[PDB]
Design an enzyme around this catalytic site. Structure first.
Site, PDB file in Angstrom:
ATOM      1  N   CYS A 233      -0.517   4.520   0.412  1.00  0.00           N
ATOM      2  CA  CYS A 233      -1.159   5.310   1.285  1.00  0.00           C
ATOM      3  C   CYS A 233      -0.134   5.895   2.260  1.00  0.00           C
ATOM      4  O   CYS A 233       0.792   5.168   2.853  1.00  0.00           O
ATOM      5  CB  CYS A 233      -2.246   4.821   2.103  1.00  0.00           C
ATOM      6  SG  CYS A 233      -3.323   5.798   3.193  1.00  0.00           S
TER       7      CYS A 233
ATOM      8  N   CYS B  70      -0.138   4.738   6.244  1.00  0.00           N
ATOM      9  CA  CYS B  70       0.271   3.356   6.449  1.00  0.00           C
ATOM     10  C   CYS B  70       1.993   3.278   7.051  1.00  0.00           C
ATOM     11  O   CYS B  70       2.952   3.764   6.238  1.00  0.00           O
ATOM     12  CB  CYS B  70       0.472   2.511   5.114  1.00  0.00           C
ATOM     13  SG  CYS B  70      -1.223   1.757   4.914  1.00  0.00           S
TER      14      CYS B  70
ATOM     15  N   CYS C  85       1.001  -1.120   0.184  1.00  0.00           N
ATOM     16  CA  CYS C  85      -0.081  -0.079   0.068  1.00  0.00           C
ATOM     17  C   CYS C  85       0.841   1.158   0.100  1.00  0.00           C
ATOM     18  O   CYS C  85       1.842   1.332   0.663  1.00  0.00           O
ATOM     19  CB  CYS C  85      -0.906  -0.187   1.385  1.00  0.00           C
ATOM     20  SG  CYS C  85      -2.252   1.196   1.257  1.00  0.00           S
TER      21      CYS C  85
HETATM   22  N1  LIG Z   1      -3.807  10.435  -0.724  1.00  0.00           N
HETATM   23  C1  LIG Z   1      -3.843   9.248   0.249  1.00  0.00           C
HETATM   24  C2  LIG Z   1      -5.800   9.064   0.406  1.00  0.00           C
HETATM   25  C3  LIG Z   1      -6.160   8.805   1.804  1.00  0.00           C
HETATM   26  C4  LIG Z   1      -6.901   7.424   1.688  1.00  0.00           C
HETATM   27  O1  LIG Z   1      -7.478   7.202   0.668  1.00  0.00           O
HETATM   28  N2  LIG Z   1      -6.883   6.624   2.673  1.00  0.00           N
HETATM   29  C5  LIG Z   1      -7.080   5.130   2.670  1.00  0.00           C
HETATM   30  C6  LIG Z   1      -5.955   4.073   2.648  1.00  0.00           C
HETATM   31  S1  LIG Z   1      -4.697   4.715   4.351  1.00  0.00           S
HETATM   32  C7  LIG Z   1      -8.028   4.602   3.791  1.00  0.00           C
HETATM   33  O2  LIG Z   1      -8.598   3.417   3.848  1.00  0.00           O
HETATM   34  N3  LIG Z   1      -8.256   5.264   4.798  1.00  0.00           N
HETATM   35  C8  LIG Z   1      -7.708   4.882   6.291  1.00  0.00           C
HETATM   36  C9  LIG Z   1      -7.974   5.709   7.258  1.00  0.00           C
HETATM   37  O3  LIG Z   1      -9.120   6.477   7.144  1.00  0.00           O
HETATM   38  O4  LIG Z   1      -6.997   6.304   7.992  1.00  0.00           O
HETATM   39  C10 LIG Z   1      -3.154   9.571   1.450  1.00  0.00           C
HETATM   40  O5  LIG Z   1      -1.987   9.014   1.364  1.00  0.00           O
HETATM   41  O6  LIG Z   1      -3.569  10.269   2.477  1.00  0.00           O
END
Ligand SMILES: N[C@H](CCC(=O)N[C@@H](CS)C(=O)NCC(=O)O)C(=O)O
Ligand SMILES: N[C@H](CCC(=O)N[C@@H](CS)C(=O)NCC(=O)O)C(=O)O
Ligand SMILES: [Zn+2]
Ligand SMILES: [Zn+2]
Lengths: 194, 196
Positions: B56, B59, B54
Site C-alpha cells: 500500500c 503505509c 504491506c
Molecule cells: N492501491 C492501494 C489501494 C488503497 C487501499 O486498498 N488501502 C488499504 C491499505 S493501506 C486500506 O486498508 N486503507 C487504509 C486507509 O484507508 O487509509 C494504494 O496504494 O493506495
C-alpha cells in the site's frame, strides 16, 4: 483433508470447465425473456473469463458465484430489445445494463475514459447458446460471497472446490490483472514514465 | 536449484537479513521516531498481532524499502509518551488516520475513528521503531500489486513474489484470506445478510 461433495460454484463450471474453440469469432447473447428478448451481438472472442464473488455482478438462480468475461467494446452491438434495457447503478464505475423485465445483465460498460478497463465490456457468456468462448480461468472476490449470505464456515470447502476445478481463489482479481490495473494508475499519476 | 532468480531483491530491512521470532511472555515496549533529539516516543503495552509486510502507497516505509512492516494492537494498550506536538494526521478523511512526525516523517500509530469500521479498536504500528526484540513476526504480504503505484517496474514483480514466498510471506493483492473473511463477516452482519 477437506470434503468437497455437494459444493456448488456456478452451473457452467460444476461439471468441469469447457475449453475455448481455436478460431472462435463470437456469438449472440439473449436475455431470459419468453417474448421480445434483449439480443446482443458479440462479434469477437472474449478474454479473462472467471467466476466472481462480487455482490454487484449477475448470477443465475441459486449460484453463489458469477461467471464473467471481457470483450473489446467495439465488438458489441445490441440487436433487438435495446429499449428494455436500464442501468442498475448509474454511479458505479462499471455501469451494468440490465433487462427491465427478467433482470438479467446484458453488458457492463466503462464510460470514464481514464478507467483501467475502458474500451472493454463485461459480458456473461453463459447467455449464449454457442460453445467455444474463453474458458473460466480463476475465482475473483472469493470472500465477498460472505456479504451475500454465505456462512464463513463454508469457505475452506469452497476454496478447496475451486482449486480442484483449477480455478484459483483470489480475494480481488488475479495477479496479472491487479498489476495491469496498478501500472495504469502509475502511468496516469506519474509514478511510472509514459 | 530454483526456478526464479531472486538475487538482489530487497523487501524490508527487517526481513532481508533474518526474521526475528516472537518471544514467550513478551508484553510490549516503546516505539520512537528518527529525530536525533526530542523524538516522539510511544508505549505499546501489549504484544501485537497480525504483523505483515504491506505494499500500500499509504503505509510508512524506511528509506529505500519497497514494503512496509505493520502490525496491530488494541488501542487501549497504546499511549503517546513524549513529542505529542510534533505529530500530525496525514489525512483526517482516511479510514485510518496516520499520525506522523512532522520533522522526520515517521508514522507513529494509525487510528480508526469510525465505530462501524471492521478494525475499530485496533491501532496499526511499525514495531521496527522499537529497540526491543520479541514482537509478533510478519505472517504474510498484503497489497503486493500496490508497489507498482509507488513506481516499482511491473517486470520486477515475478522476482518480488518468489522472494516473498522463500521468506514464508505468502503474497496477496489485498489482505490474507482469514482477514479478508473477517471483514466480510463484519459487513454481512451489519447489513443483516448474516444473523448476529
Ligand atoms: N492501491 C492501494 C489501494 C488503497 C487501499 O486498498 N488501502 C488499504 C491499505 S493501506 C486500506 O486498508 N486503507 C487504509 C486507509 O484507508 O487509509 C494504494 O496504494 O493506495
Ligand atoms: N466487495 C465488493 C466490492 C469490490 C469492488 O471494487 N468490486 C469490483 C467487482 S464488482 C469492481 O470492479 N467494482 C464494480 C463497480 O463498482 O462498478 C462487493 O461485493 O461489493
Ligand atoms: Zn429480459
Ligand atoms: Zn521525528
Amino acid at each position: 483433508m477437506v470434503d468437497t461433495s455437494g459444493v456448488k460454484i456456478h452451473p457452467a463450471v460444476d461439471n468441469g470447465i469447457k475449453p475455448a474453440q481455436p478460431g472462435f469469432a463470437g456469438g449472440t447473447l439473449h436475455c431470459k425473456c419468453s417474448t421480445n428478448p434483449v439480443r446482443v451481438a458479440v462479434r469477437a472472442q472474449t478474454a479473462h473469463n472467471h467466476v466472481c464473488g462480487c455482490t454487484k455482478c449477475w448470477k443465475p438462480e441459486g449460484a453463489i458465484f458469477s461467471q464473467v468475461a471481457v470483450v473489446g467494446r467495439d465488438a458489441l452491438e445490441v440487436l433487438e430489445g435495446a429499449e428494455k434495457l436500464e442501468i442498475v447503478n448509474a454511479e458505479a464505475p462499471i455501469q451494468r445494463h440490465r433487462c427491465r423485465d427478467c433482470g438479467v445483465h446484458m453488458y457492463g460498460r466503462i464510460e470514464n475514459r481514464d478507467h483501467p478497463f475502458y474500451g472493454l465490456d463485461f459480458v456473461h457468456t453463459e447467455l449464449s447458446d454457442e460453445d467455444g468462448w474463453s474458458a473460466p480461468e480463476f475465482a475473483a472476490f472469493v470472500s465477498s460471497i460472505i456479504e451475500s449470505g454465505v456462512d464463513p464456515s463454508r469457505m475452506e470447502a469452497i476454496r478447496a472446490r475451486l482449486r480442484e476445478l483449477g480455478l484459483e481463489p483470489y480475494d480481488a482479481l488475479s495477479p496479472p490483472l491487479m498489476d495491469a490495473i496498478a501500472t495504469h494508475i502509475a502511468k496516469r499519476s506519474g509514478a511510472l514514465a509514459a
